[PDB]
């Protein structure tokens, strides 16, 4: 899978691919790897499909219970730590999860937390997760600056997933884009790689390795 999230001047960009595999069998090209926990919180999924879907859906329930009890939106820190403490209980049992918890709150500002199934929890500005993470990192790190336009940042996230979809055999299908602000997350569409690749090739003049 390839998933990424990064912080910049205008908030957070989150982009993921849509492929599910069973070994070399391509099980699906239409999976949703972003979960919308609330209007200010997003979760990304990489690893076991069931593990990710079940526990991130469960996380949504625990975040909802927090706001009923405390009359206040859960912090990104607290939400990420609920998931990391849960997987830590299951450590050694064989769960497979690589996730990013991305959101805005007034007290924290825009925040990204990496959480995985061996128990690691890390705050940071940039993360790429999954089988195709290295390919995304290659494009992302070279064109990254703090002060991209929202338009340029959305494109870079889209382009980094495209890069990984191309090179990584276990990533592909389509690109789902999100932008997180003060006012919440905004969906910026599903982009099929079968059309996007050729569009990007022509307009950008990239992918000169391919017969086009």
């Amino acid at each position: 899978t390839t998933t990424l999230a990064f912080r910049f001047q205008g908030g957070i960009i989150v982009a993921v691919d849509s492929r599910a595999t069973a070994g070399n069998w391509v099980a699906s090209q239409t999976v949703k790897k972003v979960i919308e926990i609330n209007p200010f919180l997003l979760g990304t999924m990489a690893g076991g499909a069931a593990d990710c879907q079940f526990w991130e859906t469960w996380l949504g329930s625990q975040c909802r219970l927090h706001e009923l009890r405390e009359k206040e939106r859960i912090s990104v820190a607290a939400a990420s730590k609920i998931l990391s403490n849960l997987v830590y209980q299951y450590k050694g049992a064989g769960l497979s999860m690589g996730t990013m918890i991305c959101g805005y709150t007034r007290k924290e500002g825009p925040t990204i937390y990496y959480v995985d199934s061996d128990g690691t929890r890390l705050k940071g500005d940039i993360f790429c997760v999954g089988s195709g993470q290295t390919f995304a990192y290659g494009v992302l790190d070279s064109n990254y600056k703090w002060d991209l336009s929202v338009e340029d940042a959305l494109y870079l996230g889209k382009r980094s997933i495209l890069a990984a979809a191309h090179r990584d055999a276990y990533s592909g299908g389509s690109v789902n884009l999100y932008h997180v602000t003060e006012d919440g997350w905004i969906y910026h569409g599903n982009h099929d790689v079968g059309e996007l690749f050729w569009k990007v090739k022509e307009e950008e003049g990239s992918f000169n390795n391919v017969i086009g």
Binding site: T57, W58, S61, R64, L65, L68, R69
Partner: protein, 235 residues
């Protein structure tokens, strides 16, 4: 002494009947159901003027589509609310949908008779559970410590209940608007309350399909109190 789960010669559980007496001593809570929404209002009843009245939380959210008002030993309600919230969220987790208002009420009422020699006594609090679902629409339920619940078009509980219920008998009709129901709760609360009704010692709330469960601001309730005074003076 005597068993906690003992029947009286009339065929009633002593402890359940005695808990109903505790509920009569509690502050008044009123609920009115309409086709435009369900309104829930309470008497706050601060024991002293130094007590910051906004911290009196007798109206409570269970889910976005289900609200709750209480009367009696209000400390006992916290674990009931916690169960209701968990039951509502858990059902959404298992079934990807809102939980029915009746089913939620039934879950709360299953706790009630779990007492013996489990908890050591029944709950000393009654609840008005108000909500909306797609199947049966806008609903109001009265949940007792007996484990029984009744659906109501309108219902009062607490110290002024029998006086308030007789008034709700005359005033309620099937064509009531939401604005009309708000004023009607404020009217009946003002009638049964010891102290003079204002925005600081009484609280309104409602549940609509569009906006869900909302506790009203003190500024919003103040305007509805001013609107009530003028319309009563009008004839």
């Amino acid at each position: 002494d005597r068993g906690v789960s003992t029947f009286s010669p009339e065929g009633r559980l002593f402890q359940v009947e005695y808990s109903l007496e505790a509920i009569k001593l509690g502050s008044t809570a009123i609920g009115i159901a309409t086709k435009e929404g369900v309104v829930l209002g309470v008497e706050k009843r601060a024991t002293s003027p130094l007590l910051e009245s906004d911290s009196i939380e007798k109206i409570v959210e269970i889910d976005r589509h289900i609200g709750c008002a209480m009367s009696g030993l209000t400390a006992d309600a916290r674990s009931m609310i916690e169960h209701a919230r968990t039951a509502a969220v858990t059902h959404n987790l298992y079934y990807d949908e809102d939980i029915n208002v009746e089913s939620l009420t039934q879950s709360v009422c299953d706790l009630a008779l779990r007492f013996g020699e489990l908890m050591s006594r029944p709950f000393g609090v009654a609840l008005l559970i108000a909500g909306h679902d797609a199947d049966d629409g806008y609903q109001l339920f009265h949940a007792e410590p007996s484990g029984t619940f009744y659906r109501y078009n309108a219902k009062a509980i607490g110290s002024g209940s029998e006086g308030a219920q007789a008034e709700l008998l005359n005033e309620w009709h099937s064509s009531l608007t939401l604005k009309e129901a708000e004023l009607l709760v404020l009217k009946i609360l003002k009638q049964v309350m010891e102290e003079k009704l204002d925005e600081n010692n009484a609280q309104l709330s409602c549940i609509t399909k569009q906006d869900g469960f909302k506790i009203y601001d003190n500024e919003k309730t103040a305007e509805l109190i001013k609107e009530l005074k003028e319309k009563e003076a009008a004839e």
